[PDB]
Amino acid sequence: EYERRIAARFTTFDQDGNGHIDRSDFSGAAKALLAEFGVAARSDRGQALYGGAEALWQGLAGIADRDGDQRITREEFVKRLRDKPDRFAEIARPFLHAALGVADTDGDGAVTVADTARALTAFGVPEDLARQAAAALDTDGDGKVGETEIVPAFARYFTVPA
Numbered sequence: 001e002y003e004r005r006i007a008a009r010f011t012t013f014d015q016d017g018n019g020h021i022d023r024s025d026f027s028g029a030a031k032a033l034l035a036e037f038g039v040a041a042r043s044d045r046g047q048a049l050y051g052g053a054e055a056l057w058q059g060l061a062g063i064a065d066r067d068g069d070q071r072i073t074r075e076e077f078v079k080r081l082r083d084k085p086d087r088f089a090e091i092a093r094p095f096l097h098a099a100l101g102v103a104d105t106d107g108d109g110a111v112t113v114a115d116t117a118r119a120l121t122a123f124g125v126p127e128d129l130a131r132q133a134a135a136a137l138d139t140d141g142d143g144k145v146g147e148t149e150i151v152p153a154f155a156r157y158f159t160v161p162a
């Protein structure tokens with residue numbers, strides 16, 4: 001179970017599935033989300049999402065790329081994330097904020113549960129599970145998913161329970 005839980009988290013970052021985490025895993029994730037919502041890469045929201053993704057890669061690399069080759073292997077990839085999950089969530093905050101912007105289709109600063117599910121599928125979550133996860137992210141049940149729900153959820157998700 002534990003090792004399976006760890007692989008799940010690794011697989012989330014290893015978007016292209018090739019067994020190491022690269023900047024391009026993150027670039028690819030940004031590209032997928034923008035495509036899902038028809039947001040132009042060159043738009044303000046597009047540039048903000050790529051900048052946020054690049055910042056999260058650098059944070060994660062800072063933590064886990066022990067030999068400095070700018071790929072994080074399965075091997076290199078948990079304890080550091082478990083002991084300080086809040087710090088890692090803040091590293092991800094610009095990315096998560098930008099992702100919400102992209103998934104906000106009417107511009108009112110809120111994202112629907114259905115569009116949260118769309119975002120998750122852009123990041124490789126199969127459609128059925130994404131609906132279930134999106135629903136779970138809406139912890140106050142108002143049908144709107146926000147930064148105050150997503151950022152702590154992210155912190156928790158990357159705290160692999162022992």
Ligand SMILES: [Ca+2]
Nearest residue numbers: 014018020025
């Ligand atoms: Ca990869």
Ligand SMILES: [Ca+2]
Nearest residue numbers: 046047050051
């Ligand atoms: Ca750019």
Ligand SMILES: [Ca+2]
Nearest residue numbers: 065067069071
């Ligand atoms: Ca490395």
Ligand SMILES: [Ca+2]
Nearest residue numbers: 104105106110
């Ligand atoms: Ca919306």
Ligand SMILES: [Ca+2]
Nearest residue numbers: 104106108110
């Ligand atoms: Ca909205």
Ligand SMILES: [Ca+2]
Nearest residue numbers: 121126127128
């Ligand atoms: Ca479908």
Ligand SMILES: [Ca+2]
Nearest residue numbers: 128129131132
């Ligand atoms: Ca189902």
Ligand SMILES: [Ca+2]
Nearest residue numbers: 138140142144
């Ligand atoms: Ca909510």
Ligand SMILES: [Ca+2]
Nearest residue numbers: 140141142144
């Ligand atoms: Ca709410």
